[PDB]
Amino acid sequence: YSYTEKKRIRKDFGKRPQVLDVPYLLSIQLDSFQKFIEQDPEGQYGLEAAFRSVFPIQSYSGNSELQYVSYRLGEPVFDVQECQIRGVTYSAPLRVKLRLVIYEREAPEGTVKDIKEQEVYMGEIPLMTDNGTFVINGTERVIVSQLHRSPGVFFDSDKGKTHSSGKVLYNARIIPYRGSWLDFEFDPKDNLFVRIDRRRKLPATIILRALNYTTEQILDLFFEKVIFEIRDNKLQMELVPERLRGETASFDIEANGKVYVEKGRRITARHIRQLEKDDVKLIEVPVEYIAGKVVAKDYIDESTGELICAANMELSLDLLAKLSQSGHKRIETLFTNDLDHGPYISETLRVDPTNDRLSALVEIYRMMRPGEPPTREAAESLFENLFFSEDRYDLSAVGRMKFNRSLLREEIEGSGILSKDDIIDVMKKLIDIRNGKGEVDDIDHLGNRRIRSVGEMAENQFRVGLVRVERAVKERLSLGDLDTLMPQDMINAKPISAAVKEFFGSSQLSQFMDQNNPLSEITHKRRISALGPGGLTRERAGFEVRDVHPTHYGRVCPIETPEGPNIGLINSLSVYAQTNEYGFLETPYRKVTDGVVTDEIHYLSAIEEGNYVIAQANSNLDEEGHFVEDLVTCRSKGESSLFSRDQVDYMDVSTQQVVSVGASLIPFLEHDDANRALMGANMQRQAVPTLRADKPLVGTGMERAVAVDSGVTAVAKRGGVVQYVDASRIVIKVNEDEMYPGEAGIDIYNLTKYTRSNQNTCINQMPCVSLGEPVERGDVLADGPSTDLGELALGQNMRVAFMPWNGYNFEDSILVSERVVQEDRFTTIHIQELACVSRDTKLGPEEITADIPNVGEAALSKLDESGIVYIGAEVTGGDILVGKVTPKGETQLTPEEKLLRAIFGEKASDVKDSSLRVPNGVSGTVIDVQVFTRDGVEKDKRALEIEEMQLKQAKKDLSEELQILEAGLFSRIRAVLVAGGVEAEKLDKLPRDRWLELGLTDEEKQNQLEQLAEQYDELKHEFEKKLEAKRRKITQGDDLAPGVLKIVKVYLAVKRRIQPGDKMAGRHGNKGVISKINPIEDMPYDENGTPVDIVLNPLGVPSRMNIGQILETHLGMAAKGIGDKINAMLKQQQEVAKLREFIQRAYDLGADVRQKVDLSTFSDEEVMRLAENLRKGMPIATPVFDGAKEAEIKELLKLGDLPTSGQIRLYDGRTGEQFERPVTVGYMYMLKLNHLVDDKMHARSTGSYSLVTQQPLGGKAQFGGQRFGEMEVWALEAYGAAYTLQEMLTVKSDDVNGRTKMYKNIVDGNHQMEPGMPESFNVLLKEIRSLGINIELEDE
C-alpha cells in the first residue's frame, strides 16, 4: 500500500480479483479536444482537417487562389486564473500561414506570376482546461458529448403503415455525414421508389437512368436469366431444379425419357433432388407457357433491322413465332417468382415515365427545382452536385465503413462520394430483404448510435466559419486587383470567431459546469446527450429510444438518467466503457481460450459483441484454471442463458462495468430497486459540500478514484519530502531518483482558497500532509471541497434510528437532533457575487461616490472614501455595498413638492441613487472586492489600494519563487562540487553569491555545473520579464462593454446552517425534508446514553424497496462499533501489540476477503497513525454487485459486540421509559442537497408589473407573483368562490385602477372590492383589431 493509504485503509469485502483498474474518468473530454488541436500531418484531424477540407479555394474567375500552409495557436494572453477573475474567455489566437497564388490567363496554368505568403490572424479558439472544462466569460463550462445516428446505410420498415392492408413496406436510407439523404422505398403495389431529402416520390429505375443505365442493363442487374431454346418445332427451356420450388406444375414436366411431375402437382424437396441428381439441363415445354414471361434483352430482325421485341416486354405466342422465323433460337427471359425472387424492378420500369439518361436527369431536376425551366447543363450539374461532388457530399470514414460492412464488403475504407456500385448494392440489399433473405436493423442498437465528442463538434463549427469566409474570399478575389490586394485584406476573422463562440456559448451541449460537488463535475463531463444540433427533440422523442437497450450493457448505465422529459435522452457513460476510434461505444472483456480465462483484455464494439458468447463476472473461477461449475451463466445475441465452460468465448472484466460512476458509489446497490437507485445516483450529485469533509463509513471504493481523477484535489507530480506546508501552498522537494538533473527539483503547488462555484458554493483546498513528511508520487497533497484524505466525502454519516415519531417524520419528513446543528457539521458556505456598474448615459456618467442623497452615517461607516465597503465587514439586507449615483433629468415636481421644498428649502440635488445594496434577507461577510476601470477613467482611491495589494503580493510570490529555486539550485551545485573536491563546511563559509566561479576537472560533472549555471541566469532574466508582465496586467485598464465606465464586484461569504425545510437524502433515493430540530434531551437514546442524531420513518422502506439503506445502516453501525472499540483501546493506551492484534483480526474477517492487509509490515508508528483515524469508525468498502453479505455484516457486528439483528433497545428522551421493541439503529451516510429553504422561500404583496399584460412578473429573483393558472382558476369555480376568483383576475393582477383603490381601502380597514376591467383584455381587443377584425363592445 501507498503512504496516504498507510494513514487510513478501507476494509474491502470484494471477492473478485480486479483484473482491470478504473481508467482515467475524464478520458473522453481530453482525448477529443486533444485530437481537435493536434496538428496531424497526413491523416487530417480537427483544425488540420477543416483547412484541408475547405482549402485550397480559388476565385470565381479561376485566375487567383488561396492555399493553406500551416497554423499555430498563440499562447494565451491571460491564464485560467486571470480569465476567471476578469470574466474573459481562456483562448489561444489562431494564426494561419496562407499563400495567395495567381495564374496567368495568357499562359495555360502560369503558376509563376504572383505568390504572396503571410500569416493571418483569424479568431481565438477557447482552450480546454487541465480538467476538461472551458473558461468562457470567466465561468467554467462543459461541452457534453453527443449521441446520434451514425452515417452509413440503414434498412427499416413501418410494420403495417396503412393499418387497413397492414402490408410491410421496406425502405433503405443512405445517411451521409454531409449532403442530401438518399431514400429507397417500396409501395403497396411492390414498386421501388426513390426520394431525395424526402421530396416527391420517383420510380427507383429513374436514378439508374441518371447513372446511364439502359433498360436491358437494369434488368441484367436485378434479375437472373431463364433461357428459351427454340429447336425444330417444340419449345425447350434451360432448367435450374431449385427454382421450381413451393410451386404448382402448370404443365407435364418430363425430360429425355422419364416423366417426373404431372399437370397441377406440387413440386416438393424430393422432386427437386431427383431432377438435380439426374443432371437435367433442358426440358421440352408447351409454347403457351411463354405467354407472360418477360424478355430480358432486345432482339431485332437481322433482316429488316427493326425491333421484334424491346427489353422488359411480356412475350406472346405471336412474338415467339416471329422471333423464330427471323432467326433467333435462344431467348433470355427474366427469372421471376411471386415468393422468392420478386419482380420489382420489372414493374417499376413500367411505372418509370423516363426513357433515356437525359429524360431521367430532367425529371430529377424538375423534382427538386419544380416549375423552373430545365436545361441539360442544369440537370447534369444538380445531379452531380447531389451525391457525386467532393464538396457537397461526404459519408466520412465512419459512413463509408458502416456502409461497406452493412453491404457485406471486405474493404473498410474508401470514397466519401457515392459510386454507382454503392447505390445499386443498397437497392439490391433492400430487394433481398423484401424477398425474405436479410433483416432490417434497429436505430436504438449502439452499433447504429455513434458518440461525437467535443473536438469533432468544434471541428464542425470551425468548418462553417471557413465556408462563410470562403464566400467573401471568392467574391473579393473576382473583383480584386491581383497586385495591391493582400491575402489578409480578403479574410475576415469575425465570421469564424463568431461561429466558434456561438458553438461554445449558444449550443445546448455547452452548459455551465455542474460543480456543487466533485462527483457532479466528473459525472457531468461523462455525460451523453441525444439532444442538441443533429439530434432528437424532447417533443420528437418516442419511447423506444428512451428505454434500456440490451446493447447498453457495459457501455451505458441503465440506472442514470433524469426522471424529467429528458428521461431517455440524457445518459451517463458506464465505468469501463470507452469511445471506439470510429465513435462507437466499446467495453472491455477477458478473453477465454480453451476454458482458461486469459488476462488479455479486448474492447468489443456493439456489433462485435453480438457475435461471441460472454460469461458473466459472477462465474466462479477455478484459481486461474477455468469455470468451476460445468454450467456457466452467459449472454449472446443480446439474451442470457446457461452455456458449457468451453463454449464461453469471453467474460465480463469487472462486476462494476454495467453501472456508471455515479451508481458505482451506491453501496448495496444490489439490494435497491432500479427506480430508487436512479433517484439516489441523481441526488448524490446535488450533495452540497459541508464545512467539515467527513468520509463515508460505508463506501464502495470508487470514492478514492472519483476524488483524485476529478482533479479538485492537489496530487503530487513527483514523490519526495515536504519542505514547506502552508494553508496557502505546499512545497515538496523531489527525491534524487525521480528528480531531473537540470532544475533544482522542488515542486511548488499553490492551493486555491475560498473561491465561488457556479452554484454559489464554496471551493477551498485544505492541505492534508504534515510539514516534513515523506510522500509517494500520485498521493493526495491537498483535499478539494468534498474530499477527505483522498477519498470522496459528499456528506456526513450519522447515528440514525428507524422508527415513527409523533408524525414529525410523516411522509419522508426528517427529525434531526440539535446536536448536528451545534456541531456545525451540516453547516455550508455560500460565496455570492454582487456587481455595481457605473454606466455612461445620455445625461452624463454615473459616479461611484460615497456621496449619496439621504444616507445615515450608520450606513456610510462601512463605506470607505471611495464608496466601497471594507473587506471583512459584516453586512445584512439593505446595507450599501457600493455607492452609486445617477444623473436625473428634469421632473415635473407636483405642486405639493413645490410647496414642500419651498418650506424646507432642501432643493433636491441633480443626482439620484443607484447604489448596489445587499439583497433583502441575505447576510454575509465581505471577503473580497475587485475593481474594473476603463483605460483613461480616473481610478477610485479603493482601486488604487487594491492595486497596491496585488503588486506587493505579486512581488512576494515571485520573490519566494526565485528564493526557493536559488536555494534548491545551489543545494545541488554544493553536492556536485563534493563529487570531486569535497569541502562541505569549508565551501559554505564565504558567500554563496561567489560560488559558480568554482569549477571541477573536465568531466560530465563539470558540464552539470555549466547546466546549473546557465539555468540560474535563465531564471534570473525570466524573473524580470515575468514581473514586468505581472505589473502590466495589474496596471492594465480593462476593456468593458460600451457605455460602462467602471464595475465593482463584491464577494460575500454566507454561513448557512441546516433548518426545517432544507432537503436531505441518503444514496438509496431516500429523500426527506427536515420538519423539526429536536432538543438533545428529547432525542431517543440507547442504554449507554448516546442519543441518536436522526429519526427516519420506517414506513418509507417496504413500499420503496430501497433496502440498501437498511444494510448501510447495519454495516455503518458495525463500522462504528469497531471504531468505538479502537477508540476505547486508544483511550486506555494498551500498547501497539494489542491494537495491532485487534486490527489485523478485523481487516481479515470476511469469508473470502480479497484484499489482505498484513500489519507485520506496518511499523509501530504507522500503526498508531492508522488506529488514530480508525477510531472515528472503521471505513468499509462494499463494491457494487461484489458487496458484503449479511453473514459478513453480522460477523462484523459480533466483533463490535453489537446485536446480529442490528436492532437495539432505545429510550424515549422525554419520558425515560423504553420503546416497546428494538429499533434498527446505525450509521447512514447522509447528504444536504442544494435545495435550501432559504432559496425557495418567497412572498409578495405588491411590486413591479409586466409591460404589456400589466400582470405581476414571474420568478422570485424578479420579485414575482405566483401564477394562478387555468387549473387553479377551475378550483375556485368548483368551490363557487366568485369574489376570490374575480379578485385574482382583477385587483390582484391587471386591473390598474382596481389594485390601487383596493390597496387604499385595505389601509383604511374597509376590505371593499372595487373591480374594473383587466388591461390584458383591452390589449386582446387591440391585437384583434390590428389583425383587421372589427371586435366591438356593444354597451348596455
Binding site: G1061, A1243, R1244, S1245, V1307
Partner: protein, 251 residues
Amino acid sequence: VPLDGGRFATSDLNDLYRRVINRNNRLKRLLDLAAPDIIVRNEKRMLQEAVDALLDNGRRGRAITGSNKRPLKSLADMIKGKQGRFRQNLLGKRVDYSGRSVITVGPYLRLHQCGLPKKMALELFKPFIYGKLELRGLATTIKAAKKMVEREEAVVWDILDEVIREHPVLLNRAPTLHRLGIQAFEPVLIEGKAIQLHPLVCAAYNADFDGDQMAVHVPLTLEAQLEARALMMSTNNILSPANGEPIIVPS
C-alpha cells in the same frame, strides 16, 4: 424599450411592420415612376408576402425568420395557442398577495390550521399592517409605516399577530386537479421559513414532504375571506365531490 446597458429590445411586430411599410412605399414609388408591369407585379407579390407575414407568419409558407433562425412572432401568434393572450394571460394570471415555500409536517396543527412563516406573512399582509399601524397611531404616515416594517420593530410583530387572527389563507399545491387542491386554513405564525401542512389533508393535495412546495394566497375582501372560511375551509370540505367518500383519512 431601452435595457439598462444602453441596449434596445423591441417586439417582432416592429420588424414585420417595417417590411410592410418599405415594400408598400416602394410600390407607391414604382407607380409614380410608371414602372414596367413585371416589376409592379413583383412588388405586389412582395406586399402580399409581407402583409401575410405580419398577420399570420408560418401560415402560407416558410415563416420569415430572425437572425436567430427562429420565426418572427406575428399578430396571430399572440392570440394563438398556449403562449397566446387567452390561455396565458386571461384564463390564468400572475397574482398579487401570493407566496410559495417548501412544506413540512405540522402534526400539532388542528385540521383548520397551517404553519405560516413570520417573514412571509409580514410581507403578504403589508397593507393591513400599515392600516392597523395608523389606527394605533404608531405610524404617522405610510412612509413611516413602511420604514417601521423594514426595521421589523417589536411592536410591528404584535400588530401582525393581531391582523392574521381569524384571517383565512389559501394553500395550493401543483397540480391543481380537483377543487381540494386549494384549501383555506387559519394561519399560525411560526419562526422558520417552511410552511407547515396538516397531515390529514396531505391526501387531497397528494402532498408528500420529499421537498414538495406550496403556494399561499391571501383573500383580501370581506367577501373573499367569507368565501374562504365557508366554502374553501379544510374543516368544511372533507368528502370527495367525485365519490361520496371522506377524503380526509388517516394514513
